[PDB]
Design an enzyme around this catalytic site. Structure first.
Site, PDB file in Angstrom:
ATOM      1  N   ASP A 334     -17.634   2.693  38.746  1.00 36.63           N
ATOM      2  CA  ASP A 334     -16.873   1.567  39.333  1.00 36.63           C
ATOM      3  C   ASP A 334     -17.755   0.842  40.393  1.00 36.63           C
ATOM      4  O   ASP A 334     -18.883   0.489  40.029  1.00 36.63           O
ATOM      5  CB  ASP A 334     -15.495   2.058  39.846  1.00 36.63           C
ATOM      6  CG  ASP A 334     -14.605   0.967  40.400  1.00 36.63           C
ATOM      7  OD1 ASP A 334     -13.982   0.246  39.594  1.00 36.63           O
ATOM      8  OD2 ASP A 334     -14.554   0.814  41.651  1.00 36.63           O
ATOM      9  N   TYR A 465     -14.876  -5.437  48.138  1.00 33.76           N
ATOM     10  CA  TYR A 465     -14.497  -6.577  47.281  1.00 33.76           C
ATOM     11  C   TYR A 465     -14.570  -7.918  47.981  1.00 33.76           C
ATOM     12  O   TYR A 465     -14.347  -8.950  47.342  1.00 33.76           O
ATOM     13  CB  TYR A 465     -13.041  -6.408  46.807  1.00 33.76           C
ATOM     14  CG  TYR A 465     -12.811  -5.252  45.868  1.00 33.76           C
ATOM     15  CD1 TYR A 465     -12.882  -5.426  44.488  1.00 33.76           C
ATOM     16  CD2 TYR A 465     -12.412  -4.006  46.352  1.00 33.76           C
ATOM     17  CE1 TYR A 465     -12.614  -4.377  43.614  1.00 33.76           C
ATOM     18  CE2 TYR A 465     -12.153  -2.949  45.488  1.00 33.76           C
ATOM     19  CZ  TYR A 465     -12.229  -3.147  44.120  1.00 33.76           C
ATOM     20  OH  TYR A 465     -11.997  -2.102  43.277  1.00 33.76           O
ATOM     21  N   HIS A 523     -10.077   4.515  32.965  1.00 33.16           N
ATOM     22  CA  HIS A 523     -10.929   4.183  34.110  1.00 33.16           C
ATOM     23  C   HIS A 523     -11.511   5.381  34.873  1.00 33.16           C
ATOM     24  O   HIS A 523     -12.595   5.266  35.446  1.00 33.16           O
ATOM     25  CB  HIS A 523     -10.170   3.283  35.093  1.00 33.16           C
ATOM     26  CG  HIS A 523     -11.018   2.781  36.221  1.00 33.16           C
ATOM     27  ND1 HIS A 523     -10.853   3.255  37.511  1.00 33.16           N
ATOM     28  CD2 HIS A 523     -12.073   1.934  36.204  1.00 33.16           C
ATOM     29  CE1 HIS A 523     -11.759   2.626  38.243  1.00 33.16           C
ATOM     30  NE2 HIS A 523     -12.517   1.827  37.501  1.00 33.16           N
TER      31      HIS A 523
HETATM   32  O1  LIG Z   1      -7.715   0.811  32.909  1.00 28.02           O
HETATM   33  C1  LIG Z   1      -7.964   0.564  34.085  1.00 28.02           C
HETATM   34  N1  LIG Z   1      -9.187   0.124  34.558  1.00 28.02           N
HETATM   35  C2  LIG Z   1      -9.103  -0.112  35.931  1.00 28.02           C
HETATM   36  C3  LIG Z   1     -10.094  -0.592  36.763  1.00 28.02           C
HETATM   37  C4  LIG Z   1      -9.792  -0.749  38.103  1.00 28.02           C
HETATM   38  C5  LIG Z   1      -8.533  -0.434  38.590  1.00 28.02           C
HETATM   39  C6  LIG Z   1      -8.262  -0.626  40.050  1.00 28.02           C
HETATM   40  C7  LIG Z   1      -7.214  -1.709  40.261  1.00 28.02           C
HETATM   41  C8  LIG Z   1      -6.831  -1.903  41.723  1.00 28.02           C
HETATM   42  C9  LIG Z   1      -6.540  -0.598  42.444  1.00 28.02           C
HETATM   43  C10 LIG Z   1      -7.618   0.451  42.213  1.00 28.02           C
HETATM   44  C11 LIG Z   1      -7.873   0.678  40.730  1.00 28.02           C
HETATM   45  C12 LIG Z   1      -7.559   0.048  37.730  1.00 28.02           C
HETATM   46  C13 LIG Z   1      -7.851   0.203  36.387  1.00 28.02           C
HETATM   47  C14 LIG Z   1      -7.001   0.705  35.258  1.00 28.02           C
HETATM   48  C15 LIG Z   1      -5.775  -0.171  35.025  1.00 28.02           C
HETATM   49  C16 LIG Z   1      -4.620   0.206  35.947  1.00 28.02           C
HETATM   50  O2  LIG Z   1      -4.349   1.608  35.874  1.00 28.02           O
HETATM   51  C17 LIG Z   1      -5.451   2.388  36.349  1.00 28.02           C
HETATM   52  C18 LIG Z   1      -6.650   2.184  35.426  1.00 28.02           C
END
Ligand SMILES: O=C1Nc2ccc(C3CCCCC3)cc2C12CCOCC2
Ligand SMILES: O=C1Nc2ccc(C3CCCCC3)cc2C12CCOCC2
EC number: 3.3.2.10
Lengths: 546, 546
Positions: A334, A465, A523
Site C-alpha cells: 500500500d 495522503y 487488499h
Molecule cells: O479492496 C480494497 N482495496 C482497498 C484499498 C484501500 C483501502 C483503504 C480505504 C480507506 C481506509 C483504509 C483502507 C481499502 C480497500 C479495500 C476496499 C474496502 O474494503 C477494504 C479493502
C-alpha cells in the site's frame, strides 16, 4: 485429563535418528551389524557417551573415546575398520542430514494452540565442532514453538534415569497422568509409563500421530493447512533510531543475513508483517519490520509536509546510515509500496532489491495535476475524503475497534463500498456500529491495532495522503529514469482499489520486473494469503536479492 | 574568520579520481590522449554526463550514451576502439579502485573537532549497477564524519553552475569569506573563489593540507595519532529484548555481517565499547554492545541470585533466541570477560568465537571454597568489601562524578591502591572529593556514566560479585571440559589486579588459544588503548570468527 505433551528430539522432532545413520554407516562400510551402535553405547552408565550426554565432556572430547570403542569392538568382532575410518566425518554427516519432522512439529503446535503445555526432552551434547552452527540453527527453529526445552547435558541427567522424569514433571508442574510422552526409544519410554504417563513409541510419524490424536481427542492428522508462524509483540527485539531531533523510528528485528526492510501501508503497523517476520528470518534474512512515520512507537509530528515522499525517503536513508547498513531489500505494501518504488528511483545505491505488494509503480503525469488524476478513477474517491484535515481523523478515531473490524476484511466479507465516500459523508456511514470479526484476525489482534492507534491516532497516517502536489513535483524529477535494480510486483486478484490491471504498463519503466500474483486475495495481502506471500517473497529473495 | 570547510569527493576525499583512471585506461589501450575524458564531457551542459550528474538519468542509462560518445570521438580521431571495449568494465574498475584519502579525512575530522561545520559537495550519479554496494559503503563510511553531504544528482545542479555554490552557502548558513573549499578541478574552484571563499586546488594531499593548515591556523599535518571514531548515544540504534517478565536487556546496534556481542565489566556500560563499535562495524561485523543486566537501560532486579553466572548466561542465550541469532562472537571485559568464558563452556553451539580482555579463564578449584581463594590474593580484597549488601552501594552512589573520575584512570594516573580496602573502610578513603579528570575521558563522558548510574545505582552491578559459592558450584560441573571453539585472551601489561601472569595456565584448558598483549595498558583496556584493542580484535575476527 491430559494437559502436557513431551517430545523427544532425535527420531521424533528431527529425522533421521543418529542410531539410523550409524546403522546405514555399518552397511555402507560392510561392518558387522550393530558394531557402531555397540561402540556408541559402550560402558552403559559408566561409558563415554553417558559422560557426554550428562555434559561432563564436549563432543570434540568424546570423538577419540568413540574412536577407541570402535577399535575395541572391531578387535573383539575380529574385523578391520576401513583405512579412512573417521568418527568425526561419520557424526558430521549424521548431524548435518537431520531435518525437522514437519508433521510432528505441526501436531506439537496444534496441541499448544489447544491449551497443552509442550516440551522437548532430549539426550543431547555440548557441540563444540567447527560445524556446530547447523545444530544451533535446528535447535533455534524447533525450541521457539515449545514451552520448555530440557537437555540432558545442561541438567546432568540422562534418559532412562528415573530422576530426569521427576525433573520433567516438576518443570511441567503436572502430575504423570496429565502427560503424554513421545519417544522413538522403547527403553526411554518405560520410566515415563512406570510413573503413569501416557506413552507413544514413535516408529512412523503417521501411526504415532494417530495414537496421539486418539488419546488427546484433538485432531492432528488430515487438518487444514496451518498458517505460518506469527509474532508475539512482547517476544520481539524492539529497535529505536532517532533520524532527526523530533523523529524516532521504531522497528522489530529478527534473524541474521542480508537486511530486509518491511514497510507497511495505511492504517497499519509493523504487526501487519507478523506472518512474514518469522518465515523471512528462518529463510536466512535479517528482518527489519518498521512502524512507519506517524504509527505505533514511531514519532508522529502534526505537520502535513513531514509525510511527503521526499522527507519519508530521506529519513529511511538516515535510518540505514544510523544502523550502519549500506543497503537493505525494501518490501512495501500500500503506502509502503509507493515509498519503496521512490526509494528505488532516488536512492538505488541503498536498495539491494525492491518489492511491492498491490501498489503499482505509476509515473507522475506532468500534464495533469494529481488532484485531477485522483478524480478520474472513482475507486480513489476515499483519497479526496482524506484531504480535509480533521474530517477523516474524527471518523476513524471515534471507535478504533469498529475502524479496524470494518477495514480488515477479506474480499468475500462484505467489504466497504469505496464508491462516493465524499458524497456519503464518510467511510462508515453504511457500516454497523459493531462489525463482525473477519476470519483473517482474532479479537486480540484487533485490540493490538486499537492500542497502537491510541498513542497518536490518525493525523500522521492520514498526512501520507495530503502531499499529492509535493510528491508529484518530486516524482516529475525522476521521469527520465528507469528502475534497473532487482524488482518484484505482487498483484492481488481481489484488491478492488489497487486492481492488478493498474500494474499493466510497469515494464515500460522497470524492464527486468519479476511478478507474483495471488488469486482470491484482497487488499490485506500479508494476512489474507500469508503462506502464498511467503513463498513468493522467499523464492524472489533467494534468486534476486542474495 | 573561517568556520566551514567543504571537500570534493572524487580526487579529494577519495583516491584515485575518475579522470585519472580514464587517463590510465587511454594509455593501457594505446588510445589517443584525452579521448575518454573528451567523450565523458561531450556536449558540456547539454551532454549525457551533465544529465547523469543532475539525476535526470541513472548510471546504467548513461553507459550506452558514453559508449556512443566514445565511438563518435574515435571516428573523428580516425582511431579504432579495441574489439573488447566496454564502458561498463572501465567504470566498474574505476569506482571499485577508489579508496578514502585517509590524511584528507583526518584533516576534515580535526577541523570539525575544532568547531568547523564540514561538508562534502560532489558531482555524483544515481548508481544502479549490480556492483553499486561498493560505492554505497564508501559513501556511508565518509558521510558520517561530516555535517552535510550535497550530491549533484539529488539537488539537480552541478559544479561549476553558480546556483550550486549559493545552495552550499545556504546549507552552511555561512557567508563566503567564512568558507574554505577544496577541489581537484580548477574550473570547479572558480565560482567559489568568485563568491569570495578561500579555495585550495588539491593535487597532492600534503601541499593541499599545508595550505589548509596555514589558512585555518589549525594544525592538520604532523599531528599525534588520532583516536578511533567514538559513538554519540543519540545517533545509535537502541534495541530492547525482554528475556523474562521482569528482565529486559538494552543494546546498541551497528553494522552488518556476523553478530559480535560486546559484554562490559564493572561498573561500566555499552558506552565502554564506544571506540570499538564503529571500527568493528566498518570491519564488516554486526555489533551488539550490551548494557549488561543491572546496568543503564537494562533491568536491575534487587535479588543477588539474579546475577549468578548460570542465570546471566541463560538470559544471554534467550537474548540470542529472541533476536533470531543461532550464534554471536562473544567479546568480554572484566565481569563480561568471565561471562563469555562461561558462555563458551556451557553453550559452545551459540558461541561463534570467544574473546576476553584482561579476565583470564581460571577453572574452579573443587578443594577450596571461593571465599578462601579470594582471600589468598591481596589484590582481590576489594571483592570482600563488595560482599556486604549496602556497604559498597553507599560509598559508590554518594558522589557519582567522584566514583567514575577515581575509577577511570590510566596506570600512570595515581590509581587507587587495592591493598587492604576492607581494613581502610572503603575504596575512596584515601581519595580526593574532587579527583582530576583522566586523559582517557572528557568531562561529558564522565557525566554520561553519572546519568546511566542514576537509574539503578550499584546494587545490580555489585550483585555480580555476590554469587561466589553459586558460580563455583556451577563451574565445578564444567571441570572435565576444555574450550575448543576459537578463543582469544588479551592481557594488559599494567592491569594491577587482572595481571597478565594470572592467564599463564590457560592453554591447559584452551589448547588452541590465541593471544594478544597490550603494553602500557591499565584495567580500562577499551579506552586506554582503543587503536591497539581494535587492531587485535579485527585481525582475530577476520582470521578466526569469519
Ligand atoms: O479492496 C480494497 N482495496 C482497498 C484499498 C484501500 C483501502 C483503504 C480505504 C480507506 C481506509 C483504509 C483502507 C481499502 C480497500 C479495500 C476496499 C474496502 O474494503 C477494504 C479493502
Ligand atoms: O589496575 C587496576 N585493575 C583493576 C581491576 C578492577 C578494579 C575495580 C576495583 C573496585 C571498583 C571497580 C574497579 C580496579 C582496577 C585497577 C586498580 C585501581 O585503579 C583502577 C584500575
Amino acid at each position: 485429563t491430559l494437559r502436557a505433551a513431551v517430545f523427544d528430539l532425535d527420531g521424533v522432532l528431527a529425522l533421521p535418528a543418529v542410531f539410523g545413520v550409524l546403522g546405514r554407516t555399518e552397511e555402507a562400510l560392510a561392518l558387522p551389524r550393530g558394531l557402531l551402535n555397540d561402540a556408541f553405547q559402550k560402558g552403559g552408565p559408566e561409558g563415554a557417551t553417558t559422560r557426554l550426554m550428562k555434559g561432563e565432556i564436549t563432543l570434540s572430547q568424546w570423538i577419540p573415546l568413540m574412536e577407541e570403542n570402535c577399535r575395541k569392538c572391531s578387535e573383539t568382532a575380529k574385523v578391520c575398520l576401513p583405512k579412512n575410518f573417521s568418527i568425526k566425518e561419520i557424526f558430521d554427516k549424521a548431524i548435518s542430514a537431520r531435518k525437522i519432522n514437519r508433521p510432528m512439529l505441526q501436531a506439537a503446535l496444534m496441541l499448544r494452540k489447544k491449551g497443552f503445555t509442550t516440551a522437548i526432552l532430549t539426550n543431547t551434547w555440548l557441540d563444540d565442532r567447527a560445524e556446530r552452527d547447523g545444530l544451533a540453527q535446528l535447535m533455534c527453529e524447533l525450541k521457539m514453538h515449545f514451552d520448555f526445552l530440557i537437555e540432558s547435558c545442561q541438567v546432568g541427567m540422562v534418559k532412562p534415569e528415573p530422576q530426569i522424569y521427576k525433573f520433567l514433571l516438576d518443570t511441567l508442574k503436572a502430575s504423570p497422568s496429565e502427560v503424554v510422552f513421545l519417544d522413538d526409544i522403547g527403553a526411554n519410554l518405560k520410566p515415563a509409563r512406570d510413573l503413569g504417563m501416557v506413552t507413544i513409541l514413535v516408529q512412523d510419524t503417521d501411526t504415532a500421530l494417530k495414537e496421539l490424536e486418539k488419546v488427546t481427542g484433538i485432531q492432528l492428522l488430515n487438518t487444514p493447512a496451518p498458517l505460518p508462524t506469527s509474532c508475539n509483540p512482547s517476544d520481539m527485539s524492539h529497535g529505536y533510531v532517532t533520524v532527526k531531533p523530533r523523529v524516532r523510528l521504531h522497528f522489530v528485528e529478527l534473524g541474521s543475513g542480508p537486511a530486509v526492510c518491511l514497510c507497511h501501508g495505511f492504517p497499519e503497523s509493523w504487526y501487519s508483517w507478523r506472518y512474514q517476520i518469522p518465515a523471512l528470518a528462518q529463510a536466512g534474512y535479517r528482518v527489519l519490520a518498521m512502524d512507519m512515520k506517524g504509527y505505533g512507537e514511531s514519532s508522529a509530528p502534526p505537520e502535513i509536509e513531514e509525510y511527503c515522499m521526499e522527507v519519508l525517503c530521506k529519513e529511511m536513508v538516515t535510518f540505514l546510515d544510523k544502523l550502519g547498513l549500506s543497503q537493505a531489500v525494501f518490501i512495501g505494501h500500500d503506502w509502503g509500496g509507493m515509498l519503496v518504488w521512490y526509494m528505488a528511483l532516488f536512492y538505488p545505491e541503498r536498495v539491494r532489491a525492491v518489492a511491492s505488494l498491490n501498489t503499482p509503480f505509476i509515473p507522475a503525469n506532468p500534464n495533469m495535476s494529481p488532484l485531477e488524476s485522483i478524480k478520474a478513477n472513482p475507486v480513489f474517491d476515499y483519497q479526496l475524503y482524506f484531504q480535509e484535515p480533521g474530517v477523516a481523523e474524527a471518523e476513524l478515531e471515534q471507535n478504533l475497534s469498529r475502524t479496524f473490524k470494518s477495514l480488515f476484511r477479506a474480499s468475500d466479507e462484505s467489504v466497504l463500498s469505496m464508491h462516493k465516500v465524499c458524497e456519503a459523508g464518510g467511510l462508515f456511514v453504511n457500516s454497523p456500529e459493531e462489525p463482525s470479526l473477519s476470519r483473517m484476525v482474532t479479537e486480540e489482534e484487533i485490540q493490538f491495532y486499537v492500542q497502537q492507534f491510541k498513542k497518536s491516532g490518525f493525523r500522521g497516517p492520514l498526512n501520507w495522503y495530503r502531499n499529492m502536489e509535493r510528491n508529484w513535483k518530486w516524482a516529475c524529477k525522476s521521469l527520465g529514469r528507469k528502475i534497473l535494480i532487482p524488482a518484484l510486483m505482487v498483484t492481488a486478484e481481489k484488491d478492488f482499489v489497487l486492481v492488478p490491471q493498474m500494474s499493466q504498463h510497469m515494464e515500460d519503466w522497470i524492464p527486468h520486473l519479476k511478478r507474483g500474483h495471488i488469486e482470491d486475495c484482497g487488499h490485506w495481502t500479508q494476512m489474507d494469503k500469508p503462506t502464498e506471500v511467503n513463498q513468493i517473497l522467499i523464492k524472489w529473495l533467494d534468486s534476486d536479492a542474495r
